[PDB]
Ligand binder design. Structure first.
Ligand code: HEM
Ligand code: HEM
Ligand SMILES: *[C@@H]1O[C@H](CO)[C@@H](O[C@@H]2O[C@H](CO)[C@@H](O)[C@H](O)[C@H]2NC(C)=O)[C@H](O)[C@H]1NC(C)=O
Ligand SMILES: *[C@@H]1O[C@H](CO)[C@@H](O)[C@H](O)[C@H]1NC(C)=O
Ligand SMILES: [Ca+2]
Ligand SMILES: [Ca+2]
Lengths: 172, 143, 141, 168
């Protein structure tokens, strides 16, 4: 029906898609829940589904997922920018392009098998399974998918940062 | 698509000299080394961390022999690949949940192994024929 | 990601490639064109027949680019920045073609350097070619 | 560049202005105790003389002053990568071993690949440094070289080099 972008979409790589009619929720279609907490604490393993490219750079025919653990924030800016200080940051990305790294984004490294997210995986939720209440939460939304296997970290924008904006957008 | 008689003859001639007991194990070990996520399906094969451990694993060699035998079976029936690989595709899709792209990766790794084994005899024409063969095998083994 | 051991293996393998790099790249281009004809749509102005001088020159250029990437393995995005911009914007080459060319380069290296294409070296060269492809396909849109 | 790993804790000094004759590090002017526009990737590390225990030697050459060049770092012998190894580096090494420096070629004369570590890479000597480690070079052990690239020198007094054409 309509698409609304984040007001600061240069700093918060988020856009919202609204369907014409509410989708029929079943065993194959079901919304993820926006977290009430911050599950992006370092070491937490979330499942990143994706429809993006695979090891042959071919868009995957079947949906896949990986269990990427969130990495230390300082290690991630240091991996892409220079030294996590604005006056010494440099375009040090192992991939050509630079991710959007700020306080609204976290980073998840590759899994134990050196597998990561590639082109076309952006927009996929960093789904985190809360074992206490057995609910799946979109801890982050994959923003930097250009980290196929060269850059060690994929950049995910924190949903809790955008949670206030999206809820205000659902109202209208 | 139908494979031309010249391409079929080239594929058969090159496969006649393929060491069935070693080439398949080499290809499977190379797949597990280059693409370490494929080691996820062979966690029952023992140590698979070091590349030397992967290539020297007896279980990996035996399973590579079985995989290369399946490749030979699909080669003898190049015109009927889905029928010959229905059971294996069902196994991989349901019992093992192997992603179809892993089959294409193993086909490419097998082509690399064949080139490594045969030197300049793996000409670009016979490589194109073998790429068609492995693409057919992977498509018949997928979905 | 390229580990220091992987970088060492790639540097050694490309060093023993040495001066044969131009014809290695020409053979890799020929293998890509024959095995995967869909990659020929990006070369409509080239003579794509076997032994073509134009394909040989482009293979020499590709191998020189790969040599520069190997020499700057720690700064590959800067080494391939011009090529990244070119392939991503002017030519709009789809990344699957980059993976096909990487596979064909690996096949050429295996066929021409069988003694030095060990599984560890094969994995390292695959990782380096994936890094090259990712740098060149990063700006694709 | 935190080559010895990334440290932990508060960075104490940022811009230390030391001319050399200081009794301790916490005696230079600097700009504060804990005031720094740094990260933990900028932790400075040093290598000292009595710890490194450096010495140079030539192994597996046709003469006592030729062959593969091997440098000892922290009690273990290692070779030198030939990347960035040129005639100035060879001259510095030859004058360091204290034997004729009239002509100082590069490349091990007939030595095979060395064994163990490869310590120095891209040594940039101006030709006047007292030894090979006062020159500008990459960090000890930080390189992607194999032992096929072992650097060497050929210290000769411009007298035993002979050239001729044979077979024509
Ligand atoms: C690409 C062509 C392939 C062929 C022709 C092939 C063939 C076979 C054959 C003949 C078997 C034995 C079936 C049985 O024992 O009942 C098998 C099982 C299996 N395959 Fe494949 N395979 C291929 C690719 C792959 C790949 C790429 C993977 C993993 C990434 C894989 C993982 C497995 C596993 C885990 C088993 C069962 C192991 C066991 O029974 O102990 N296969 N496959
Ligand atoms: C590792 C992968 C690759 C490398 C190192 C590479 C390198 C190069 C280099 C050095 C040039 C010369 C550009 C110039 O001199 O201005 C070039 C041009 C070009 N590349 Fe690639 N390339 C790669 C992948 C590909 C692939 C896979 C394709 C197509 C399937 C492709 C299509 C082209 C085209 C169409 C040109 C223009 C040549 C011309 O107009 O004459 N590239 N590439
Ligand atoms: C490089 O050449 C030198 C000189 O011929 C070799 O050193 C000689 O080795 C033989 C052993 O076969 C000794 O008897 C000589 O006394 C050695 N000469 C000197 C001056 O040391 C050396 O072994 C060669 N290195 C190789 C072939 O790797
Ligand atoms: C955009 O940024 C401004 C200030 O940087 C902030 O006040 C505003 O809340 C941001 N937008 C949203 C939707 O939060
Ligand atoms: Ca400062
Ligand atoms: Ca060198």
């Amino acid at each position: 029906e309509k698409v609304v972008l984040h007001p600061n979409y240069s700093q918060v790589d988020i856009g919202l898609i609204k369907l014409k009619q509410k989708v029929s929720v079943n065993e194959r279609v079901m919304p993820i829940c926006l977290p009430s907490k911050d599950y992006a604490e370092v070491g937490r393993v979330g499942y990143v589904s994706g429809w993006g490219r695979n090891a042959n750079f071919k868009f995957t025919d079947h949906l896949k997922y990986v269990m990427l653990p969130v990495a230390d924030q300082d290690q991630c800016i240091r991996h892409y920018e220079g030294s996590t200080v604005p006056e010494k940051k440099t375009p040090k990305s192992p991939v050509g392009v630079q991710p959007i790294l700020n306080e609204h984004t976290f980073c998840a490294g590759m899994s134990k098998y050196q597998e990561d997210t590639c082109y076309g995986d952006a927009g996929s939720a960093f789904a985190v399974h809360d074992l206490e209440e057995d609910t799946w939460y979109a801890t982050g939304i994959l923003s930097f998918d250009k980290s196929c296997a060269v850059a060690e970290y994929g950049v995910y924008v924190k949903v809790t940062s955008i949670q206030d904006w999206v809820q205000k957008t659902i109202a209208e | 698509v139908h494979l031309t008689p010249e391409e079929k003859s080239a594929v058969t001639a090159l496969w006649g000299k393929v060491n069935v007991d070693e080439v398949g194990g080499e290809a499977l070990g190379r797949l597990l080394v280059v693409y370490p996520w494929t080691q996820r399906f062979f966690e029952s094969f023992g140590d698979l961390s070091t590349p030397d451990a992967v290539m020297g694993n007896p279980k990996v060699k035996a399973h590579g022999k079985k995989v290369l035998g399946a490749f030979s079976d699909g080669l003898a029936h190049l015109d009927n690949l889905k029928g010959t690989f229905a059971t294996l595709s069902e196994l991989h899709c349901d019992k093992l949940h192997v992603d179809p792209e892993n089959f294409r990766l193993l086909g490419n790794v097998l082509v690399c192994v064949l080139a490594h084994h045969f030197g300049k005899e793996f000409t670009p024409p016979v490589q194109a024929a073998y790429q068609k063969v492995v693409a057919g095998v992977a498509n018949a083994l997928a979905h | 990601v390229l580990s220091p051991a992987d970088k060492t293996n790639v540097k050694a393998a490309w060093g023993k490639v040495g001066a044969h790099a131009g014809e290695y790249g020409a053979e890799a281009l020929e293998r890509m064109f024959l095995s995967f004809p869909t990659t020929k749509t990006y070369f409509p102005h080239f003579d794509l027949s076997h032994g073509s001088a134009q394909v040989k020159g482009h293979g020499k250029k590709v191998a020189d680019a790969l040599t520069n990437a190997v020499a700057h393995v720690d700064d590959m995005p800067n080494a391939l920045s011009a090529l990244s911009d070119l392939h991503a914007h002017k030519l709009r080459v789809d990344p699957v073609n980059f993976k096909l060319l990487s596979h064909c380069l690996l096949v050429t290296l295996a066929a021409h350097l069988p003694a030095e294409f060990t599984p560890a070296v094969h994995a390292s060269l695959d990782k380096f070619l994936a890094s090259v492809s990712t740098v060149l396909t990063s700006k694709y849109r | 560049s935190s080559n010895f790993g990334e440290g932990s804790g508060p960075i104490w000094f940022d811009d230390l202005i030391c001319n050399g004759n200081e009794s301790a590090l916490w005696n230079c002017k600097h700009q504060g105790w804990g005031k720094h526009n740094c990260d933990h990737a900028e932790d400075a590390g040093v290598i000292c003389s009595k710890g490194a225990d450096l010495s140079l030697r030539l192994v597996d050459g046709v003469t006592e002053c030729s062959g593969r060049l091997e440098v000892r770092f922290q009690g273990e012998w290692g070779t030198i990568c030939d990347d960035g190894w040129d005639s100035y580096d060879a001259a510095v090494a030859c004058k360091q071993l204290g034997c004729p420096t009239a002509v100082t070629a590069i490349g091990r004369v007939n030595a095979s690949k060395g064994f163990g570590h490869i310590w120095l890479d891209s040594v940039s000597c101006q030709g006047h440094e007292p030894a090979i480690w006062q020159c500008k070079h990459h960090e000890w052990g930080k390189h992607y070289c194999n032992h096929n690239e072992d650097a060497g020198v050929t210290c000769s007094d411009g007298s035993d080099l002979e050239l001729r054409l044979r077979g024509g």
